[PDB]
Design a protein around this motif. Structure first.
Motif, PDB file in Angstrom:
ATOM      1  N   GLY A  30       0.792  -1.230   0.000  1.00 18.84           N
ATOM      2  CA  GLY A  30       0.000   0.000   0.000  1.00 18.84           C
ATOM      3  C   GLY A  30       0.823   1.278   0.000  1.00 18.84           C
ATOM      4  O   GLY A  30       0.269   2.375   0.109  1.00 18.84           O
ATOM      5  N   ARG A  31       2.140   1.133  -0.138  1.00 18.17           N
ATOM      6  CA  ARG A  31       3.071   2.267  -0.105  1.00 18.17           C
ATOM      7  C   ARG A  31       3.710   2.527  -1.469  1.00 18.17           C
ATOM      8  O   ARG A  31       4.300   1.631  -2.067  1.00 18.17           O
ATOM      9  N   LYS A  32       3.584   3.763  -1.946  1.00 16.99           N
ATOM     10  CA  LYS A  32       4.169   4.194  -3.215  1.00 16.99           C
ATOM     11  C   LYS A  32       5.664   4.471  -3.049  1.00 16.99           C
ATOM     12  O   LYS A  32       6.076   5.252  -2.183  1.00 16.99           O
ATOM     13  N   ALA A  33       6.471   3.827  -3.886  1.00 14.15           N
ATOM     14  CA  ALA A  33       7.917   3.949  -3.804  1.00 14.15           C
ATOM     15  C   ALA A  33       8.567   3.812  -5.176  1.00 14.15           C
ATOM     16  O   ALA A  33       8.076   3.077  -6.037  1.00 14.15           O
ATOM     17  N   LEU A  34       9.660   4.546  -5.376  1.00 12.53           N
ATOM     18  CA  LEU A  34      10.501   4.387  -6.562  1.00 12.53           C
ATOM     19  C   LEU A  34      11.476   3.236  -6.303  1.00 12.53           C
ATOM     20  O   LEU A  34      12.222   3.264  -5.330  1.00 12.53           O
ATOM     21  N   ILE A  35      11.462   2.228  -7.174  1.00  9.76           N
ATOM     22  CA  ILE A  35      12.385   1.096  -7.063  1.00  9.76           C
ATOM     23  C   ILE A  35      13.374   1.046  -8.228  1.00  9.76           C
ATOM     24  O   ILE A  35      12.976   0.852  -9.376  1.00  9.76           O
ATOM     25  N   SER A  36      14.661   1.207  -7.925  1.00  9.30           N
ATOM     26  CA  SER A  36      15.697   1.159  -8.952  1.00  9.30           C
ATOM     27  C   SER A  36      16.645  -0.004  -8.754  1.00  9.30           C
ATOM     28  O   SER A  36      16.915  -0.408  -7.628  1.00  9.30           O
ATOM     29  N   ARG A  37      17.146  -0.544  -9.857  1.00 13.65           N
ATOM     30  CA  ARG A  37      18.172  -1.572  -9.781  1.00 13.65           C
ATOM     31  C   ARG A  37      19.544  -0.904  -9.720  1.00 13.65           C
ATOM     32  O   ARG A  37      20.250  -0.789 -10.733  1.00 13.65           O
ATOM     33  N   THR A  38      19.893  -0.455  -8.514  1.00 14.62           N
ATOM     34  CA  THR A  38      21.150   0.246  -8.237  1.00 14.62           C
ATOM     35  C   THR A  38      21.614  -0.092  -6.838  1.00 14.62           C
ATOM     36  O   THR A  38      20.799  -0.201  -5.931  1.00 14.62           O
ATOM     37  N   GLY A  39      22.915  -0.274  -6.659  1.00 19.85           N
ATOM     38  CA  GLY A  39      23.444  -0.602  -5.341  1.00 19.85           C
ATOM     39  C   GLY A  39      24.637   0.227  -4.925  1.00 19.85           C
ATOM     40  O   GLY A  39      24.911   1.267  -5.525  1.00 19.85           O
ATOM     41  N   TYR A  40      25.336  -0.243  -3.886  1.00 19.76           N
ATOM     42  CA  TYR A  40      26.606   0.336  -3.421  1.00 19.76           C
ATOM     43  C   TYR A  40      27.395  -0.738  -2.667  1.00 19.76           C
ATOM     44  O   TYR A  40      27.910  -0.509  -1.573  1.00 19.76           O
ATOM     45  N   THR A  41      27.498  -1.919  -3.270  1.00 19.96           N
ATOM     46  CA  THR A  41      27.996  -3.107  -2.564  1.00 19.96           C
ATOM     47  C   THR A  41      28.756  -4.079  -3.484  1.00 19.96           C
ATOM     48  O   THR A  41      29.606  -4.853  -3.021  1.00 19.96           O
ATOM     49  N   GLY A  42      28.450  -4.039  -4.780  1.00 20.84           N
ATOM     50  CA  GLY A  42      29.123  -4.900  -5.761  1.00 20.84           C
ATOM     51  C   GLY A  42      28.437  -6.232  -6.021  1.00 20.84           C
ATOM     52  O   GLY A  42      29.001  -7.115  -6.676  1.00 20.84           O
ATOM     53  N   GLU A  43      27.226  -6.384  -5.497  1.00 19.17           N
ATOM     54  CA  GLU A  43      26.384  -7.536  -5.804  1.00 19.17           C
ATOM     55  C   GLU A  43      25.177  -7.037  -6.585  1.00 19.17           C
ATOM     56  O   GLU A  43      25.002  -5.823  -6.759  1.00 19.17           O
ATOM     57  N   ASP A  44      24.337  -7.960  -7.048  1.00 19.25           N
ATOM     58  CA  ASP A  44      22.998  -7.579  -7.469  1.00 19.25           C
ATOM     59  C   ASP A  44      22.428  -6.786  -6.290  1.00 19.25           C
ATOM     60  O   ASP A  44      22.834  -6.982  -5.141  1.00 19.25           O
ATOM     61  N   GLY A  45      21.519  -5.864  -6.575  1.00 22.86           N
ATOM     62  CA  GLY A  45      21.035  -4.968  -5.539  1.00 22.86           C
ATOM     63  C   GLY A  45      20.107  -3.896  -6.053  1.00 22.86           C
ATOM     64  O   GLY A  45      20.261  -3.392  -7.171  1.00 22.86           O
ATOM     65  N   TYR A  46      19.147  -3.548  -5.209  1.00 19.37           N
ATOM     66  CA  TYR A  46      18.137  -2.576  -5.544  1.00 19.37           C
ATOM     67  C   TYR A  46      18.103  -1.463  -4.501  1.00 19.37           C
ATOM     68  O   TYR A  46      18.576  -1.644  -3.368  1.00 19.37           O
ATOM     69  N   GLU A  47      17.571  -0.309  -4.897  1.00 17.29           N
ATOM     70  CA  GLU A  47      17.366   0.802  -3.980  1.00 17.29           C
ATOM     71  C   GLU A  47      15.921   1.281  -4.007  1.00 17.29           C
ATOM     72  O   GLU A  47      15.292   1.349  -5.060  1.00 17.29           O
ATOM     73  N   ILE A  48      15.397   1.603  -2.835  1.00 24.03           N
ATOM     74  CA  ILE A  48      13.990   1.949  -2.696  1.00 24.03           C
ATOM     75  C   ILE A  48      13.842   3.346  -2.112  1.00 24.03           C
ATOM     76  O   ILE A  48      14.172   3.586  -0.948  1.00 24.03           O
ATOM     77  N   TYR A  49      13.348   4.262  -2.937  1.00 26.42           N
ATOM     78  CA  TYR A  49      13.070   5.624  -2.510  1.00 26.42           C
ATOM     79  C   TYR A  49      11.601   5.734  -2.122  1.00 26.42           C
ATOM     80  O   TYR A  49      10.724   5.339  -2.885  1.00 26.42           O
ATOM     81  N   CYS A  50      11.346   6.257  -0.926  1.00 25.55           N
ATOM     82  CA  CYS A  50       9.987   6.388  -0.409  1.00 25.55           C
ATOM     83  C   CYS A  50       9.802   7.716   0.306  1.00 25.55           C
ATOM     84  O   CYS A  50      10.772   8.432   0.552  1.00 25.55           O
ATOM     85  N   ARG A  51       8.554   8.047   0.620  1.00 23.09           N
ATOM     86  CA  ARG A  51       8.261   9.182   1.488  1.00 23.09           C
ATOM     87  C   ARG A  51       8.843   8.894   2.873  1.00 23.09           C
ATOM     88  O   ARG A  51       8.830   7.744   3.325  1.00 23.09           O
ATOM     89  N   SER A  52       9.362   9.935   3.529  1.00 23.54           N
ATOM     90  CA  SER A  52       9.931   9.829   4.878  1.00 23.54           C
ATOM     91  C   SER A  52       9.032   9.049   5.826  1.00 23.54           C
ATOM     92  O   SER A  52       9.511   8.256   6.631  1.00 23.54           O
ATOM     93  N   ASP A  53       7.728   9.282   5.705  1.00 30.39           N
ATOM     94  CA  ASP A  53       6.713   8.655   6.543  1.00 30.39           C
ATOM     95  C   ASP A  53       6.686   7.137   6.427  1.00 30.39           C
ATOM     96  O   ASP A  53       6.428   6.447   7.415  1.00 30.39           O
TER      97      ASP A  53
END
Length: 358
Positions: free
Chosen positions: A178-201
């Protein structure tokens, strides 16, 4: 001190906090060694909401970004992102960052927390035409999931087809319980990895759903310790270390993010082009200590009685079972196998330059 929307959740998961440049963020949750091991074989969830995020819109946003950035931001399409440096005329680095194109002439810049005000003043200085710079830093949280099992966990969080995402691709306004979020296939670790941008709340909510969905795969909260150990093995730069006012993206090993033949002029182009075409006078390397000692950021590196550079990040390598360092040193010293002297409290201790990335 400065705090992410996740802060109030640290105690529960055993987060040992450090005052990381104004922001108090976890260095660990259990053990640097276990955290590194998880992201390597399971997955790992990092809080990374300290990062700044700045919206750049207006008809001239692309031209504006093309002057400011070292990468060719023309190569972006909505749904796609890129990693870039932002340089001074002399090729020294204002910041390194990710740009997401959210639509025609809207862009989201994900910048280092330490630099938001610096980056903002530098950008506003060089604004021209129809350009709007909107700081959305304290509205957006950022959770990263990193490892071979990251994809499998992310399936269980949203209906959206995150499995279709290629590296640097993203889905906007995706649903996570039920939460709207931007999901990107980007990391900072050197493995497969995703990043999730959401509202602070919504950050703590999504954090909990990630620990639940990751429980079966061996997912643990990770901190700044593991972050640096992983960065070594992937040879990933960190601003303030690998990248500063005085270190060039070429020197830091991110020339791939410098498109020097872009038709657009950009700040630093002339200096960076030469370093790309002839090679730079300094080269970012991996050091592992051959003798007992702790290297840290700023320690001088010597060969045959003469400085050859400085250690830029100090950490430990489980892979090697050794104390290790990223160092910026003269190119002529940069060959694998070369021995150098790193100054640790007024006494020279040897290190041997190693193959990185792994």
């Amino acid at each position: 001190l400065k705090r992410t929307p996740l802060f109030d959740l640290y105690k529960e998961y055993g987060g040992k906090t450090i005052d990381f440049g104004g922001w108090e963020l976890p260095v660990q949750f259990s053990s640097i060694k276990k955290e590194h091991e998880a992201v390597r074989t399971a997955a790992g969830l990092f809080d990374v909401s300290h990062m700044g995020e700045v919206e750049v819109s207006g008809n001239d946003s692309l031209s504006f970004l093309q002057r400011l950035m070292t990468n060719d931001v023309s190569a972006l399409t909505p749904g796609r992102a890129q990693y870039t440096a932002m340089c001074y005329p002399d090729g020294g680095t204002v910041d390194d960052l990710l740009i997401y194109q959210k639509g025609e002439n809207r862009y989201l810049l994900v910048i280092n927390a330490s630099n938001i005000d610096k980056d903002l003043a530098w950008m506003k200085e060089h604004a021209a035409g129809d350009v709007q710079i909107d700081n959305q830093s304290d509205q957006i949280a950022l959770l990263a999931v990193q490892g071979p099992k990251a994809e499998a966990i992310l399936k269980n969080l949203t209906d959206a087809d995150v499995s279709a995402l290629k590296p640097f691709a993203f889905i906007d306004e995706a649903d996570i319980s039920g939460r709207k979020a931007l999901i990107s296939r980007t990391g900072y670790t050197g493995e497969d990895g995703y990043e999730i941008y959401c509202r602070s709340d919504d950050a703590m909510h999504i954090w909990k759903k990630i620990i639940d969905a990751g429980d079966a795969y061996g997912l643990i909260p990770c901190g700044l310790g593991a972050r640096d150990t992983l960065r070594f093995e992937a040879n990933i730069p960190l601003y303030g270390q690998e990248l500063t006012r005085d270190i060039t993206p070429i020197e830091a090993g991110i020339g791939f993010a410098v498109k020097h033949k872009k038709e657009s002029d950009f700040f630093g182009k002339s200096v960076l082009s030469e370093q790309k075409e002839n090679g730079a006078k300094r080269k970012l390397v991996g050091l592992e200590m051959i003798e007992k000692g702790i290297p840290r950021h700023g320690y001088e590196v010597f060969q045959n009685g003469k400085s050859v550079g400085k250690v830029t990040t100090g950490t430990q390598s489980p892979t090697l079972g050794k104390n290790v360092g990223l160092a910026l040193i003269d190119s002529e010293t940069s060959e694998i196998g070369t021995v150098v002297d790193v100054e640790i409290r007024k006494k020279l201790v040897k290190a041997k330059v190693v193959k990185t990335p792994f």
